[PDB]
Design an enzyme around this catalytic site. Structure first.
Site, PDB file in Angstrom:
ATOM      1  N   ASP C  36       0.863  -1.078  -0.186  1.00  0.00           N
ATOM      2  CA  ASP C  36       0.056   0.054   0.109  1.00  0.00           C
ATOM      3  C   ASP C  36       0.873   1.482  -0.006  1.00  0.00           C
ATOM      4  O   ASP C  36       1.882   1.190   0.711  1.00  0.00           O
ATOM      5  CB  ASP C  36      -1.011   0.145   1.147  1.00  0.00           C
ATOM      6  CG  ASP C  36      -1.982  -1.203   1.146  1.00  0.00           C
ATOM      7  OD1 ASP C  36      -2.795  -1.152   0.279  1.00  0.00           O
ATOM      8  OD2 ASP C  36      -2.427  -1.822   1.981  1.00  0.00           O
ATOM      9  N   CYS C 168      11.202  15.201 -31.216  1.00  0.00           N
ATOM     10  CA  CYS C 168      11.152  15.155 -29.995  1.00  0.00           C
ATOM     11  C   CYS C 168      11.290  16.802 -29.269  1.00  0.00           C
ATOM     12  O   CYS C 168       9.979  17.546 -29.398  1.00  0.00           O
ATOM     13  CB  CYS C 168      12.329  14.319 -29.056  1.00  0.00           C
ATOM     14  SG  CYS C 168      12.050  12.763 -29.265  1.00  0.00           S
TER      15      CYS C 168
END
Lengths: 362, 363, 362, 362, 363
Positions: C36, C168
């Site tokens: 978690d 890019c």
């Protein structure tokens, strides 16, 4: 010439007669002026790299700049060929002194947004003395309007107060800080034929009442007009600084207290070769408090023409600090206090506050 | 014969242009400049300064780093026609990085103004204007031509407006090195357009020969301050080396006159003639004081003057202690000895002469 | 099974026929999904704890997410029981990919406020491939509108440019980054019956002109359309990544260059048991540059079905990294490069880009 | 009484019959209440010094406060002389739970500005159970409006969802977190005579479908309704927490799975004197993942009346942690996990969730 | 008489007032307070807290630091007429520093309000009000009289409005120590103005004896919480010592009744009668638990009650391990044993009794 010493006392005292600074003083000026960006007098801008590298606390920067400036004024008297350079550095000094980095403690502490308007003589006394010295050195009127404005504020505030002088923080009166302000009035008068310095007698009478211990030749730490309180400790650095400046206004005042000052605070040691200065009564420790008693006493010895004491103090102060000249520029490996290179520079060149006052034109 | 800790012979550096090829270590420096994604200095046009953060370059120095790389790239373009496109591409990046606030922003932070171009600050805009010209000479592109004309006009107007010949950096600080870049940028503009902005050069060369130079020692004083009239009383080797190298492209006779005296004043030959190191000022035996760039700028000057012996001596002093290696066909120095270290060694290794850059033939 | 190796090459290659991942791949998925808050695929939110703990530089997070995603897509093909999980993780991948932490370099560098609008194929090529893969795996239309919008932008930009493909950063053309974009078009076409992939032939013709050295089987580093420059260094990681993806579109293209690629860059050592990959020509050093030549070559070997080279590379890469299975979750004490666990995961499970394209429905 | 143990298991289990807490529980309450400014239940304000000193990660502070609160509720049942103090602490608990420091991760992650409005059952389930317990203990209506508002939100959200329950983050369903929310509905009903708890049967039916492995008595880690995915790992801490709370609603549900839960995860060692709990299947390692399997299993053992297993777990957990009692206040030199003093406190006092539900009034 | 680490005898501290002079070590403490430029705590009125940054004083404690210094300065004023002006000056500074946001701002940061005076927060405003009164008794100055009347009215009104006798600190936390300061401030106001605000005192003393004291042990419980009715079940030595010291100035008989029992409950004499240390709570042999101030506040209490023997014992325990030294006529402790260390030792060394402060004759 002991180890850790760069020139003789005889040589420092002879600089003015020889019309030349000693090589080590020159090397100090190089530290001040040489390297790009990081030298303290590189530019007019609000750039403080030099003081960041020295780890100078912000509250002290204003004194650093002031004492450099007082030294540069004496460099101007010593060597006519350096007078232009000195003027240029004093210009920078004045312009840096006005940066918020230097005065901003006034605002951060909650005392106001304007460092000039009322109180804060710790800042504006030095600034006003610097304005005058700049003008005496250079003949330039670049700051003359500001100088007149600030001189008028100081004059008015003195006139308005029930005590003779002006406070630093609200309710804190210091005789050192006042001494700078009164000396700035003498400089203004020299430049303009005015009589702002007439206030001086009432101030000298006042600081000789509860603020001095006349038998010990020492001033108490501070005065607080709201309560009437005089802090009960005497202070050597306070007294040394004050007597040095007062010597340029009323030589007889300082001549009377100087021998008693020495008896009270100065310790000669190492078979007469050295001296160090106790900060207060009731202790054998040297250089307590702010740790500047010895350095300010070096200045005082210079002002009073006391070669022997100057030599003793500089033998104490300079060698442990480990001076070296690298690329014709002076560094100290281990500065022993705050304002270390500043005060040693100042004391090495200092021509006397009276002589700065009478400085012939350019 | 290859001295120890060295990558190529002096004879090889000097031969690059005749062979139409860079040495393998220069190629490896170009790889350091261009190879690795994101962290190479000439990776992108963006306002990204990772390469300079990794080298620990102080912000005030980034503008000079970019400039000196650019001047080197311009010579790469003359040396090898097959690398000219690459060099152009890098100069494009150079120019665009030079305009980022990270590079010029000290001007504002110091309280001198919000616009780095408008007045003063010749330290910044002199280099920028030279870069604009060199970019155009290398590539033939007009991408920056408008800006180049605008800035060239500002420089011209400011020279004309001042009572002294030239332009200040900070307010009331005049530096001859920084001016030399600006005057050179005028020559480049004139070459590209047929104008006569360079006419101001003679008055400047006359001016710097008055109080700013010690003519017997062949050395310039540190700076001039027009408000007070002060000239700082120390001579400076890096100042002089840089100035004489650039002036050699405008008035060769000026630099030829002072170069031998400069050497006598500052250069120390040692190790039985195999090495040399350069004192930064008079009155000292210490080498590379001050900013610590006297030796590096003197290496450049030696290249500009064709002085193979002194070049070799300086590079034997500078390069080996810095511990070059080539890893993955790319050049790294373990122990750079100064600021601007790989920049200036790159520049000096390739430098074709400022005059030759001025006369650079088209693509 | 050498030391520091978790399963045999024969076992990785058999996963799909056995319809099950190896225990160490399952343990990697646990690292990805278990704990978690700190596991990378814990939530959709703009929370990057997992990448902070790995010390992933911000510029690399986008590739981390992408390569994980490409691995999850192959997990979906391998085990039908894990397909729902894989779909879930891809959902998270897509949503994390859109957080400003991932793309915000585009803005910080000064290139724009919108990462999708123009150029930036390095980001949006991967995002578009992820959108398609998400949909192939799950059948969900949650991102379909965005996928169509982004596919249209890519298509339009290819059509508008004089060179085949998209840059890019402005002015920087990379073949790897393009290969991802072209592959995203094939995926869109598979999902929708469109013909966006028709642009592929012109791109494959283009990258075979100045961008490749055909004798050595290696692409140059980059292309810069403003100047016309092709950087003169060949790159192994660039070529390995490109050839792997191209193999899914034009298998013959990659089959032609693969043997030559290996001759140029791959060093077999330790009596045939290991291999490492040189990043460029003119050097004996392995894994220079970005340090990914070996990892991407591992992927390429998987894509080409080259079990021997796979085995060699993994013997080089995995053991020094010191794998550890604690609980039933995989950690590496000493990852040898950036994108380490991502790429090893991907290469262990990779079913081939062509097989992803032809993935049967849920 | 082994070394590092402060009181016997027989003594903890007898507290309620003796109407007194053990001296070490009292000393825990002193840690909680005693010191000025740094004790966790010193004031209502948004001051978190106590949690800064313990180095509690921000994401965990909500659980720390919750589990303290559930413990304080049992202190209220055990000793009537401590009920007013427990009420006071629960008031502080509720007010601290509402500070942004506790819930603000919801906003920082990008899920919303309001922690209550939608989803986030991890936060608001605990808050709602705390509201009810505060009221049961004290009889005060200070939070009754908020309690009714939040109970309605929870009820409505359950009714609106196709699956039985509520998610935490968007598209993450956790049974532990739901169990707290459903229990809060039972407390509301007890206080107000309403029938919110009628939803419980549909939820218990639901979690018994794909979310549990019924043979092993263990819940899977999470469920993701968008994809339909159930993560394929079983979790011991998840299951221990869930079964403990479910025991207060449907005792038969937990009684059916408890023996199988133990077989699956619990390792008895040290000749029967100790126990430690594996976090998942396919490993011999204890307390993997979040590292709370053993602590939550201690709570479960208390809830189920299993003295033997409680004793074993506490012999494993407590001694290595090195309890000390200084100034009548309990400190652990070496806490072995997150939420360490919280969970040991809770498990030492826990009267059973069913008994909290049926707590007699003031 | 004179153990190691002790600076003056107990007989000397207790004789200060009769000799009209502070001991040399007390003077040296005043020098620490006043001497050095910018870093001494009583250097200026400004919102500058360097002295407290150097001591690492947590922000929540600065208010108590200033307060206890102030109470000590008030006794310095009674001891030596020649130091009364100085003490007044320091109290002026005290008051003005107490009003800085650095001191009170926790109130706001915790979410309890923007105004530290308006309601509750007796922990702050009780001390501030007592300081206002003491400033005026010492100096005769009316500088703060308006604020003093305003705050005294707020306190009075709040006591009148509450169902329990007194005022809370944080919302719903009632502490008897904190209240004792507030009630004492009312007595000082009444001394100065002839008013009868102190009439509320009887109901408060009846209240703290009904539920908040264990009368057999002579000890107060830790706190009271009016919403729930809860009294925390632990007794506290520091709480009780502080409270009994201040109550002794208002109702001497109240403290005289509980003092012997307080000692039996908490005080441990050791080292063959030469030392003492104080347990913070029941059910423990550990000394100076909790906030770690039981011993220090008991030192103060002993001074207030005229208990020379216990004073001497406590100071033999507290002072020597802390390693006192006089350097340049100024007192430093190498190893302070607790929070508020030099403050409380200063206070206890000079404390003339709260009753004697109340009756302080004019300048």
């Amino acid at each position: 010439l002991p180890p850790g010493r760069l020139a003789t006392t005889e040589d420092y005292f002879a600089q003015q007669a020889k019309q030349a600074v000693t090589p080590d003083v020159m090397a100090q000026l190089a530290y001040m002026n040489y390297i790009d960006f990081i030298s303290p007098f590189y530019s007019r801008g609000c750039s403080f790299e030099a003081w960041e590298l020295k780890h100078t606390p912000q509250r002290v920067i204003k004194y650093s700049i002031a004492f450099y400036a007082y030294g540069l004024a004496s460099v101007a008297l010593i060597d006519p060929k350096l007078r232009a350079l000195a003027g240029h550095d004093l210009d920078i000094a004045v312009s840096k002194m006005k940066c918020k980095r230097v005065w901003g403690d006034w605002e951060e502490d909650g005392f106001g947004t304007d460092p000039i308007e009322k109180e804060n003589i710790m800042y504006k006394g030095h600034l006003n003395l610097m304005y005058g010295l700049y003008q005496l050195v250079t003949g330039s009127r670049r700051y003359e309007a500001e100088h007149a404005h600030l001189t008028r504020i100081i004059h008015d505030e003195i006139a308005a107060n029930p005590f003779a002088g002006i406070v630093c923080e609200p309710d804190n009166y210091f005789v050192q800080c006042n001494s700078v302000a009164y000396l700035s009035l003498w400089v203004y008068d020299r430049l303009h034929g005015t009589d702002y310095r007439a206030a001086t007698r009432a101030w000298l009478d006042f600081i000789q009442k509860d603020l001095i211990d006349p038998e010990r030749g020492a001033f108490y730490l501070s005065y607080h007009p709201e309560s009437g309180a005089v802090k009960p400790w005497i202070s050597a650095y306070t007294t040394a600084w004050t007597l040095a400046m007062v010597h340029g206004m009323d030589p007889a005042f300082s001549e009377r207290y100087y021998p008693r000052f020495k008896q009270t605070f100065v310790e000669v040691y190492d078979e007469g070769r050295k001296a160090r200065v106790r900060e207060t009564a009731g202790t054998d420790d040297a250089d307590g408090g702010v740790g500047l008693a010895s350095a300010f006493t070096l200045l005082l010895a210079r002002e009073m023409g006391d070669q022997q004491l100057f030599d003793q103090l500089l033998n104490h102060l300079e060698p442990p600090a480990k001076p070296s000249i690298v690329s014709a520029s002076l560094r100290y490996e281990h500065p022993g206090s705050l304002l270390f290179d500043e005060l040693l520079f100042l004391a090495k060149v200092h021509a006397g506050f009276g002589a700065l006052l009478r400085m012939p034109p350019p």
